[PDB]
Symmetry: C2
């Protein structure tokens, strides 16, 4: 089968074959037929009595592990641990952001750039703002956010966009969230040998844990990032590997933590570093981003996006990356080995993400700007080691428009508001187009790449099908970057791919049919948006014609995201089967019984066209339930 | 191979074969040859690009996972997740204890029974005590303990017995602990795909996480349990399955959390329940404990111990267990199936541990005594369903002495203190016998059973070898219960098994050669003891001739325990190989490089006699280093 639908990706794969280096596709081929027990989730290693593998087919073979655990128990515990790991990644990101907020000052490297957003957040956290210094408010808000992570007494703080009905449903179900780290610890405790051996209770614990990701960790990370670095607005950028410059220093920012990439962007305008780039024979400094850190700097500053997850290696294959600076998460360790075949300096910066044989330059949060400057200086000085005979940059780049935060979307919707009617600054125009049926619904396309799927194929096919069916699409993460590379993040795309209702809406509001809402933590924005719509219509989020899709997901973070999206009341389609087919009870809970609990459920569909059809049918069913 | 060295265990295995019921041994046999990849730790399932298996033999076969992770990376992440799971189990136990402390009242079900212990703990937590109400002090202490779990700013609180040198070494190494749930979340975050791919850093993160178990979670759980339920003192009890009564109601308490078992013990003396037991035709109520909850109630009240981990099923096989009340952890789910073959009521009580097809009676912490009375009444009423023709109780039980908390040990040591010299109430006599060489050292024997080892064989052989070599032995958990069943927890054992120096010490102090220090969380007591000795000698804990042994461990909790014991500076022998042989770098870190870091290291030895020899040699070389 084809490795990708992206032509630049294919050219660089040919180059990697010529250079004798191996990619993620080569390692996937080397893995051959993957273990059936692990693929079905019926393998357990939770204690040293094991490893235990039970039959994925009930009634045949070994039925129980040594402790007596059934296939359903093993599957449910494995699923819960995936959710806990994803929640941990997102919560650690949000915790770093909250600490950065706590360390803001007027004359420091980290300031408050959006005071209005900070005051609204302070209102949401019961922090007084009138007649107060802005940094005192910021510190109080950071304290409340940090308490959300580890409070042992009392209730956590949740955003006002979350409907009261959803909160009450969670409380009745027993999944109402506690402090984030406490829920992660609870999930890890209940999967220990000889604890929870009941699939339904295990799934409910995992949902409870995922809620602390969706509504607390990711939400606080996003809102505090907006406070410190600015709320995203409509902004132009370029996407795909063609953004690399042969005649300039190329600095590629990979990872998830935004403070480092923000400081690197600021350092790139330093006169001394620009002069240094000129002195090593380069035209200038060309910052390019990848994955979620690329999404953040692109949403807030228009930094060009070099590529998504499965392109990271190919960025090095060009031979033009002088410095690849990585913080945490979704950083293929093979990059270190790959960096030996080129001049590239592979720089790790976080104590959480040491990588063997990489150059470690710890990013100092006490002096973020100076630390970023020294890291960037190492990248710039590496330009002298460039071998221009090994350089091949495909001439394939695509224009994209992004920056669609909830605030930006509301500002755009204000155009189609009659002044004599109003109100302004609400999601009411979006609610109106959804209720009238001009738009059939809204769908979130999120997730990673996965060698099991032709890279970016499922993302593009799902998005095109949805917008052709007058479903407005919001995108995050690597799916958003696939849309950017393909050319869907363009106003012109409205008349090229969208159906009649969505084309009319795009023309009236002057937006692309596909709205890039940011990184994987920025999925919280989507929740926020949906919540607002629900609160405007006086219904729960499970009554709306909305859906989420993860066509090509790979990470534990994706599992946690899908779990909290379903738990919030939004049906979720998974384009890659999770390792649960071995447990019939777990499959039945996730795809059938979940609808009785939270009004939504998982759909597993590896065919994107069938997924689009199912999404449209489900949205029409919910519309008929709602009367619209 | 023999299944056990215990004769009562063998008789009940014959009965289980005659009854056509499966045991843990039968399921272990059914599992046959366990997966080599999982056994070596070279299998990874951390993302849905996998499952990935790399060769346990370097230089052959597949070398890297799909993301590029090496065998060392996969092994180190798997080990770290085991540590995180064990830390989560212990920390959740301690968190429940702290919450119970927070709800103590003068006229409530949960009171303060050891005010002196509470005042000393309050001193350790910087809580004022002079001229204050005892329950105000208790609530402040509980608040400080709870803050240890989830504080995001500042430093955690550690017991005064921990040497300053050990803390400084931890700070220099980068493993100084943070809040417990924060460290669990950090480990889970760094094992996520594309985060940490460096074995040394991964092992250091796991050590940092395990410290929050050893010195914060388990320590606080133990000390708060002492405050609420009484400090253990020397007390007599009986051990092994013979403690069951044919003519009495048999109520078996299995699990770890002590509040439920304490309330059940209190409810058993209720006049209405005793009258009800008489009216259902029984002579009375016979409470028996298993595993750690049995250890707690036995340490504090002399409740008879029915058996350790791999005996739990056999307790039901007797046909005499009218009620089996379980809370969390090390509860084989197969019990639910097994109790169908008998009249036994298998009662789950904790929302953390639901077991399918068991009778769920949620233990209400708000009204603990009434809830315990209701559960106990269900067990008593089940006596009418006893089938006395199916009853077979082995006439095999053994006298044991336990209750050796640090306070009790100090009280015993006061006997050999010359009044004209002093001081009293110190560990000084123990330090003196260790320094003079009358005792060669002290060894902690802890851990579970494991079907991979003849049950209780390794525990007994290791203990007998150590005490024969004039090494005083402290025991916890299932190892302590194996010692109890065998008969080592007896004063007479001093003249039957101990060497000359240990026999003299036992005669002078009037103690058994093997000291039962309580449950698995009570391993913190051992740390406390060692710390005091170190603080009395002005040395670090790694300079002492001390060691820990886990001859037959199975649980993730055991992994976390061994990790924090080594990190504290105490060499640890493992009688069951952990899944790390696939990663040569991880093996080298755990067994060789750890000594450079923390002055102690792991020893993997499956032969108990060889383990005793190695322990004696290591203790002698540490003595020669210390000059004693
Ligand atoms: S999933 Fe289990 S059975 Fe399959 S290779 Fe991995 S450890 Fe072995
Ligand atoms: S927890 Fe149970 S099923 Fe899992 S490895 Fe241990 S004995 Fe086997
Ligand atoms: S994290 Fe890497 S090694 Fe582990 S399953 Fe995913 S791709 Fe394979």
């Amino acid at each position: 089968k084809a490795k990708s639908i992206d032509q630049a990706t294919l050219q660089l794969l040919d180059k990697a074959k010529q250079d004798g280096v191996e990619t993620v596709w080569d390692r996937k081929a080397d893995m051959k037929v993957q273990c059936g027990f692990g693929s079905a989730g019926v393998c357990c290693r939770n204690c040293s009595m094991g490893p235990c593998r039970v039959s994925p087919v009930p009634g045949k073979g070994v039925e129980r592990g040594i402790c007596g655990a059934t296939a359903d128990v093993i599957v449910s515990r494995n699923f819960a641990r995936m959710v806990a790991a994803g929640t941990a990644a997102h919560s650690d990101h949000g915790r770093s952001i909250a600490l950065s907020l706590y360390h803001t000052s007027k004359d420091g490297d980290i300031k408050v750039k959006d005071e209005n957003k900070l005051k609204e957040v302070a209102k949401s956290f019961n922090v007084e703002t009138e007649g107060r210094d802005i940094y005192d408010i910021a510190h109080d808000v950071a304290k409340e956010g940090l308490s959300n992570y580890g409070k042992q007494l009392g209730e956590v703080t949740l955003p006002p966009s979350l409907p009261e009905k959803r909160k009450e449903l969670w409380r009745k179900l027993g999944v109402y969230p506690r402090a984030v780290d406490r829920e992660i610890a609870a999930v890890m405790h209940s999967t220990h040998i000889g604890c929870n051996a009941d699939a339904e209770a295990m799934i409910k614990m995992s949902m409870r844990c995922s809620l602390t990701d969706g509504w607390m960790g990711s939400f606080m990370g996003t809102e505090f990032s907006d406070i410190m670095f600015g709320t995203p607005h409509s902004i132009d950028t370029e996407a795909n590997l063609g953004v690399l410059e042969k005649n300039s220093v190329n600095v590629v920012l990979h990872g998830h933590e935004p403070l480092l990439s923000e400081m690197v962007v600021e350092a790139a305008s330093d006169p001394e570093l620009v002069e240094l780039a000129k002195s090593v024979g380069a035209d200038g400094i060309n910052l390019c981003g990848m994955c979620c850190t690329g999404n953040e700097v692109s949403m807030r500053h228009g930094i060009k996006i070099a590529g998504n997850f499965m392109q990271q290696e190919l960025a090095v294959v060009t031979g033009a990356v002088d410095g690849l600076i990585v913080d945490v998460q979704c950083i293929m360790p093979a990059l270190a080995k790959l960096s030996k075949s080129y001049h590239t300096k592979f720089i790790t910066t976080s104590p959480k993400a040491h990588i063997t044989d990489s150059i470690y330059m710890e990013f100092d949060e006490e002096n973020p700007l100076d630390s970023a400057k020294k890291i960037l200086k190492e990248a710039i000085l590496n330009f002298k080691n460039r071998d221009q005979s090994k350089v091949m940059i495909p001439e394939l780049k695509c224009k994209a428009i992004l920056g669609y935060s909830v605030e930006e979307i509301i500002n755009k919707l204000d155009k189609v508001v009659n002044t004599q009617i109003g109100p302004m600054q609400t999601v009411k125009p979006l609610a109106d187009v959804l209720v009238s049926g001009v738009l059939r619904g809204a769908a979130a396309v999120v997730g990673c790449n996965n060698p099991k799927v032709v890279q970016d194929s499922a993302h593009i096919e799902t998005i095109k099908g949805l917008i052709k069916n007058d479903v407005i699409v919001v995108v995050t993460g690597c799916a958003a970057q696939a849309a950017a590379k393909y050319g869907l993040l363009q106003k012109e795309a409205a008349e090229k791919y969208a159906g009649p209702g969505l084309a009319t809406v795009c023309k009236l509001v002057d937006i692309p049919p596909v709205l890039h809402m940011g990184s994987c933590v920025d999925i919280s924005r989507i929740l926020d948006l949906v919540g607002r719509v629900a609160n405007l219509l006086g219904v729960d989020m499970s009554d709306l014609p909305v859906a989420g899709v993860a066509p090509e997901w790979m990470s534990e973070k994706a599992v946690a995201i899908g779990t909290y999206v379903v738990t919030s009341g939004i049906d979720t389609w998974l384009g890659v089967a999770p390792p649960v087919t071995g447990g019939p009870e777990v499959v039945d809970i996730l795809t059938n019984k979940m609808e009785d609990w939270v009004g939504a459920k998982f759909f597993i569909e590896t065919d994107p066209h069938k997924a689009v059809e199912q999404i449209v049918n489900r949205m029409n069913e919910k519309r008929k339930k709602l009367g619209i």
